[PDB]
Structure 1
Amino acid sequence: ASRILLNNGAKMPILGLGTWKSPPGQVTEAVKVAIDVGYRHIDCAHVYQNENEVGVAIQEKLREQVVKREELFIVSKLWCTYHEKGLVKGACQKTLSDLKLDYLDLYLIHWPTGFKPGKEFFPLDESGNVVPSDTNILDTWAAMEELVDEGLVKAIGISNFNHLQVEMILNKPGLKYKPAVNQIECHPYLTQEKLIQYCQSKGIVVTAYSPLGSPDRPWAKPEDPSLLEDPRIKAIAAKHNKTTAQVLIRFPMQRNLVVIPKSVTPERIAENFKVFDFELSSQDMTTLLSYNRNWRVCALLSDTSHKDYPFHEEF
């Protein structure tokens, strides 16, 4: 299928467009091209500082009668500096206003960690440590629940939560909505078998981010492993007469995951969509999973001491 069923009864397209690091100057066109070749899910975030430009793309294609809103699946994320209960609605309404939407299909707690509230997205002390806020996961969740109850969002979830932090919400006394989705880093070098096992066994859909290894991540090192340049994957792709990326995208799809590859390059936006016309074999799958090195690209070492930092646990 092209969409997966969420616990709120809605269907989420398994392929969406990533927008982290998509420059404002270029993401409007990115989103317009994506919608034209068939993407219906867009992954956004206030912290990406481009939601206005996404918004412009979406409104235009609506008005062009290319798509209707009910066909779109728009995701955004509550940033760490807005975890306080009194800050959540405003944060959501800023995103809705930027995107020019009257609701979000899915809204996620971006990271489990709260940061000191203020203008700066990554507030630092004088020694380079990120300054936390005195917020906890459960209170933030209750604020997320309100947004559903108020019709601002159809569904809520989490992102970058380890299985203990997921359990905390699941077991929350007086829980109103279970998380629909957990959006985590996932690719052949970080295959997340245990967390995916956990999440799926709980009826929680897993979305795979940085499926191509985020080669444009601002802290990349030349010596870092590169999925897109991996000769082993290239060979699997050539066998299927597909590109390396196409394979890297088809891989999470065959694990019953949602996947959200990012591009602002029109030809790669279309390339990345052409993944519904082939299947990776059982061996292929097995082979890609064996490349796991539990290697992640998205972490924040300056925040490792946070009580809620997620990657100290095994999964």
Structure 2
Amino acid sequence: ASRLLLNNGAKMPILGLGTWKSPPGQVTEAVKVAIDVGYRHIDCAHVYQNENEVGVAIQEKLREQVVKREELFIVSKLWCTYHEKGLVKGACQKTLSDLKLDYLDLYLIHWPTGFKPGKEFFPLDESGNVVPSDTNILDTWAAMEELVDEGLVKAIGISNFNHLQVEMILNKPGLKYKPAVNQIECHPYLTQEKLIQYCQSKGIVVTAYSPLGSPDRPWAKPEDPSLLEDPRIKAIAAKHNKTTAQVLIRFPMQRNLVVIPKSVTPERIAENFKVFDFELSSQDMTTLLSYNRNWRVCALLSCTSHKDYPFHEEF
């Protein structure tokens, strides 16, 4: 199955290109190659600091006629700093302006944690912790529903919301629109079994980010495990004659998740796409599921003491 049906009836492609860490000059050729390769799903976000450059690529392919706008699935996110109702719309409008679009297929609240409104993405205080916003999660969803009603975003989702937080959006009195997706970190070390199960039971679509363990994350330490270099998984890639990266993408796909591997390497963007012609066995699925360490790659450490920090619960 190449696409998942969402709540709004939209068909969301099961595989997308990640743009976090993709430098400005490199993201353009990368979005282009992706599209040429077959990727019709692209993952953006304001804090990634390259949406503008990503947009130039999509514009070039539409001009070149390789794609019609209704063939791509553009996703973006609301940074924790524009959580305050009156700031939401304006932020959506900047993402659209940069990407050079009329509407976003899906717009997500980037984190359950809202930050102090300001120029800087991470308004740190005197102890290295984030200066929290006053904002409550509900008004924000309410601010997000207004975008759908205005026809600026086809769908609205959540990202990094634990099952408790998810639940409250679901029970908010007078709810108009239901979370379409909940993009969460997921790979062999963070299998997210319970949360995936909850989201799916509530009809929400789960999108796995950092599928390859995010080798390039700024804070990586040369002592942490490395999924691309885990011998046990090289073992499985052997039997399929695919790369670990290909087996690390098939994995969430077979669990029914959208996967969004990142890469600015033309050769790799293609390698990551050839994953529709093979199947990890049931035991392969079972094997990779046992590799769980509850090991997070993106844990937003500066917000461990924020009222809405998502990761203190079991899920």
Which interval holds the TM-score relative to the shorter structure?
A: over 0.9
Q: Distance in 1 between matches of 2:302 and 2:290?
A: 31
Q: Which residue of 1 aligns with 2:126?
A: 126
Structure 1 position 162, deviation (Å): 0.2
Structure 1 position 129, deviation (Å): 1.3
Q: Distance in 1 between matches of 2:187 and 2:128?
A: 30
Structure 1 position 310, deviation (Å): 0.2
Deviations 1:65-105 (CA, angstroms, capped at 9, x unpaired): 10110000000000000000000000000000000000000
Task: Look up the SS of the partner of 1:154 in the other structure.
Answer: strand
Q: Which residue of 1 aligns with 2:225?
A: 225
Q: Which residue of 2 aligns with 1:46?
A: 46
Q: Distance in 1 between matches of 2:302 and 2:90?
A: 27
Structure 1 position 301, deviation (Å): 1.9
Unaligned runs of 5+ in 1: none
Task: Look up the SS of the partner of 2:153 in the other structure.
Answer: coil
Q: Distance in 1 between matches of 2:102 and 2:129?
A: 37
Q: Distance in 1 between matches of 2:301 and 2:76?
A: 24
Unaligned runs of 5+ in 2: none
Task: Look up the SS of the partner of 1:155 in the other structure.
Answer: strand
Q: Distance in 1 between matches of 2:107 and 2:300?
A: 22
Structure 1 position 115, deviation (Å): 0.2
Structure 1 position 126, deviation (Å): 1.9
Deviations 1:118-170 (CA, angstroms, capped at 9, x unpaired): 10000011221110000011000000000000000000000000000000100
Structure 1 position 300, deviation (Å): 1.9
Deviations 1:233-259 (CA, angstroms, capped at 9, x unpaired): 001001001000000000000001000
Q: Which residue of 2 aligns with 1:182?
A: 182
Structure 1 position 196, deviation (Å): 0.4
User: Given the two structures, how large is their TM-score scaled by the length of structure 2?
Assistant: 1.00
Structure 1 position 277, deviation (Å): 0.7
Q: Distance in 2 between matches of 1:236 and 1:20?
A: 28
Q: Which residue of 1 aligns with 2:26?
A: 26
User: Given the two structures, how large is their TM-score scaled by the length of structure 1?
Assistant: 1.00
Q: Distance in 2 between matches of 1:266 and 1:107?
A: 27
Deviations 1:218-276 (CA, angstroms, capped at 9, x unpaired): 00010100000000000100100100000000000000100000000000000000000
Deviations 1:265-296 (CA, angstroms, capped at 9, x unpaired): 00000000000011100000000000001000
Q: Aligned pair count? A: 315
Deviations 1:193-219 (CA, angstroms, capped at 9, x unpaired): 000000000000000000000010000
Deviations 1:32-61 (CA, angstroms, capped at 9, x unpaired): 000001000000001101000000000000
Q: Distance in 1 between matches of 2:161 and 2:150?
A: 25
Q: Which residue of 1 aligns with 2:245?
A: 245
Stretch moving more, 222-231 or 293-302: 293-302
Stretch moving more, 125-134 or 209-218: 125-134
Q: Distance in 1 between matches of 2:243 and 2:63?
A: 34
Q: Runs of at least 4 residues of structure 1 off by over 3 A?
A: none
Structure 1 position 302, deviation (Å): 1.9
Task: Look up the SS of the partner of 2:28 in the other structure.
Answer: helix
Q: Distance in 2 between matches of 1:53 and 1:139?
A: 31
When the two chains are superposed, the root-mean-square deviation of aligned CA atoms in Å is 0.4
Task: Look up the SS of the partner of 2:4 in the other structure.
Answer: strand
Q: Distance in 2 between matches of 1:89 and 1:176?
A: 17
Q: Distance in 2 between matches of 1:49 and 1:293?
A: 31
